Amino acid sequence: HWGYGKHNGPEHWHKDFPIAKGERQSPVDIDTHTAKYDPSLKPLSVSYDQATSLRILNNGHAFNVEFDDSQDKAVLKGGPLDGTYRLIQFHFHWGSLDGQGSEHTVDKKKYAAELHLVHWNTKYGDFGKAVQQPDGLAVLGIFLKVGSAKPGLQKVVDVLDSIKTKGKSADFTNFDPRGLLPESLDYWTYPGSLTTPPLLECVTWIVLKEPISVSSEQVLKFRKLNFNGEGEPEELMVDNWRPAQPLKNRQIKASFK
Ligand SMILES: Cc1ccccc1S(=O)(=O)NC(=O)Nc1ccc(S(N)(=O)=O)nc1
Ligand SMILES: [Zn+2]
């Protein structure tokens, strides 16, 4: 039932998912002047050398690039995290226009899109169990701005025509997520939630300060995807972002001065 339209969008989600008005919902605005530098935060450890991508799926609200998460092949460690978090999938949120699309904002600034690399804590055995824990997930959030092309993104862009509509998937092996990372791993971190239903409060958010640049042509191809299934009326997959939620009793920490 839920989606991003006028009648099923973020402002309606609380009726099926009351945690939508919870105490640690995501995304949030990152007020850069109020975020506190935490010198005890460690460098982030992004170890994607052994990543095994498998498939790309249009799920009706975004597209997921899925990875083999049955071994420690692509893991996130360090930073605010205790233990080891395995990469399971990544996806993006984006706008109908370059001036919006990101979920997190920075001093109220909206980026054209936001990449989420979703990882689960191996102490909980699988993703389904992890989402039931307050430290179950670590999502690495990376802002996209429109400028120069991101070469490492192009393989993703070029397969999208084969998964235009909801429920379509395509083989997507040997994709290297390292090609989507910015130079710096400076980050902000805070406790939050899944940003789509079921909106579970299981995420340590790690949002990188440095955006990546993608080309206008690259984001335009995102906007050619469909929310609908094949044979249903075409509704472009755009503006699949949840707006900033109240920070409430939370402090955003920065890894950098
Ligand atoms: C629930 C859940 C639990 C177990 C297995 C699958 C699923 S799910 O696929 O139905 N839902 C999600 O994975 N939700 C999800 C994932 C990531 C994000 S986020 N915060 O990166 O945008 N939001 C929601
Ligand atoms: Zn997301």
Curated annotation (Swiss-Prot):
Swiss-Prot/TrEMBL site (Involved in the binding of some activators, including histamine and L-histidine) positions? 89
Q: What is its EC number?
A: 4.2.1.1, 4.2.1.69
Q: Phosphoprotein among the record's keywords?
A: yes
Q: Which CDD domains match?
A: alpha_CA_I_II_III_XIII
Name of the top EC class for this enzyme: lyase
Effect upon mutating residue 139 to F/Y? Strongly impaired activity
Q: What is the effect of changing residue 196 to H?
A: Higher affinity for bicarbonate. Enhanced proton transfer capacity
Q: How is its activity regulated?
A: Activated by X-ray, histamine, L-adrenaline, L- and D-phenylalanine, L- and D-histidine, L-His-OMe and beta-Ala-His (carnosine).
- Localized where? Cytoplasm; Cell membrane
Q: What is the effect of changing residue 61 to W?
A: Impaired activity, rescued by 4-methylimidazole (4-MI). Impaired activity, not rescued by 4-methylimidazole (4-MI)
According to UniProt, residues marked as the site described as Fine-tunes the proton-transfer properties of H-64 are: 4, 59, 64
Where do the annotations place substrate binding? 195-196
The active site of this protein is located at: 61
Co-factor: note: Zinc. Can also use cobalt(II) with lower efficiency, but not copper(II), nickel(II) and manganese(II).
Reaction catalyzed: hydrogencarbonate + H(+) = CO2 + H2O; urea = cyanamide + H2O
Identify which cofactors the protein needs according to its UniProt entry. Zn(2+); Co(2+)
Q: What outcome is documented for mutating residue 64 to Q in this protein?
A: 2-fold decrease in enzyme efficiency, as determined by kcat/KM ratio, and efficiently inhibited by chlorzolamide
Query: What's the effect of swapping residue 4 to F?
Result: Enhanced activity
Record disease entry: Osteopetrosis, autosomal recessive 3: A rare genetic disease characterized by abnormally dense bone, due to defective resorption of immature bone. Osteopetrosis occurs in two forms: a severe autosomal recessive form occurring in utero, infancy, or childhood, and a benign autosomal dominant form occurring in adolescence or adulthood. Recessive osteopetrosis commonly manifests in early infancy with macrocephaly, feeding difficulties, evolving blindness and deafness, bone marrow failure, severe anemia, and hepatosplenomegaly.
Functionally, this protein is described as follows: Catalyzes the reversible hydration of carbon dioxide. Can also hydrate cyanamide to urea. Stimulates the chloride-bicarbonate exchange activity of SLC26A6. Essential for bone resorption and osteoclast differentiation. Involved in the regulation of fluid secretion into the anterior chamber of the eye. Contributes to intracellular pH regulation in the duodenal upper villous epithelium during proton-coupled peptide absorption.
User: What's in the misc comment field?
Assistant: Target of drugs used in treatments against glaucoma disorder and breast cancer.
Q: What is this protein called?
A: Carbonic anhydrase 2
Q: Which organism is it from?
A: Homo sapiens
By which gene is this protein encoded? CA2
